[PDB]
Amino acid sequence: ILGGREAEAHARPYMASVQLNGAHLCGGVLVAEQWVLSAAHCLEDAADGKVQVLLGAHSLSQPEPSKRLYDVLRAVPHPDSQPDTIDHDLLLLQLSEKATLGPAVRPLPWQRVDRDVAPGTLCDVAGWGIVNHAGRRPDSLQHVLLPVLDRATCNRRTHHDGAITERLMCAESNRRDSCKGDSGGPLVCGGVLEGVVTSGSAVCGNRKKPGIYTRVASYAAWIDSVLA
Fold first, then answer.
1. Known active-site residue 61
2. Fewer Cβ within 10 Å of end Cβ, the chain: N or C?
3. DSSP 8-state class, residue 136
4. Active-site annotation holds for 41
5. CA angle 31–83–76, rounded 5-degree value
6. Given 10, 24, 41, 58, which residue is catalytic?
């Protein structure tokens, strides 16, 4: 997260760290007691690796009473996701057991009705991704409030040049943005999950390249089917 601040510890009890061989790989969001939603490209590399989910964390490294590392019983990338595209970039991870809930671990409601978030709406993005261009990784959860950008403008040639489908949304990315290691993390509006961070684009915090997020409401049928 570039241009943000350290989040209040455990104030986002839905926040998950998707880990590969004990190292933070992607953000994720607890959407049911036993299920974490993230981005498919997070796994599109993992292969042999041991995939786990850390819940209840603020610091990735430091002792905390609420921290709990879960194995994953199944990893379900969206069947239409593809390594060379930003489309359908969702990943559901089933935890080895239902998460132990408490003040620091709680699923977040997610939008099932397929309607766009209104342009200008301020939404919260959280994660442990890099916080500057030098690529330094923060140890504790960061977050930033970003205004939603109208899809039309986001699709302008200088921006994303027609790549933003009705299944995607954008947020402004000027000095503030999600970055490498923030992929899979949640875009939350008024306490509701609306978006998941998609593929890291080559430059973080570039105003001509708005952040791109997968619209969870657009994939509600798919999500529901997996969870059922």
1. no
2. C
3. P
4. yes
5. 30
6. 41
| Locus of tokens 């933070």 | 24
- If phi > 0 it is left, if psi is from -120 to 50 it is alpha, else beta; for residue 47 that is left
Catalytic pick among 24, 78, 89, 178: 89
> What counts of helices (H) and strands (E) characterise the chain?
2, 13
Nearest-Å Rg of the Cα atoms of the chain is: 16
- The 8-class DSSP code of residue 177 comes to B
Q: Please name the residue that has the structure tokens 């609306």.
A: 194
Task: Tell me the resolution in Å.
Answer: 1.8
Q: Is 17 a catalytic residue?
A: no
Residues in the chain: 228
- Give buried/exposed letters for 213-222 (b at 16+ CB in 10 A, else e): bbbbbbbeeb
Rounded distance between C-alpha atoms, residue 104 and residue 16, angstroms:
11
Domains, the chain: 1-12+108-217 (2.40.10.10), 13-107+218-228 (2.40.10.10)
Experimental method: X-ray
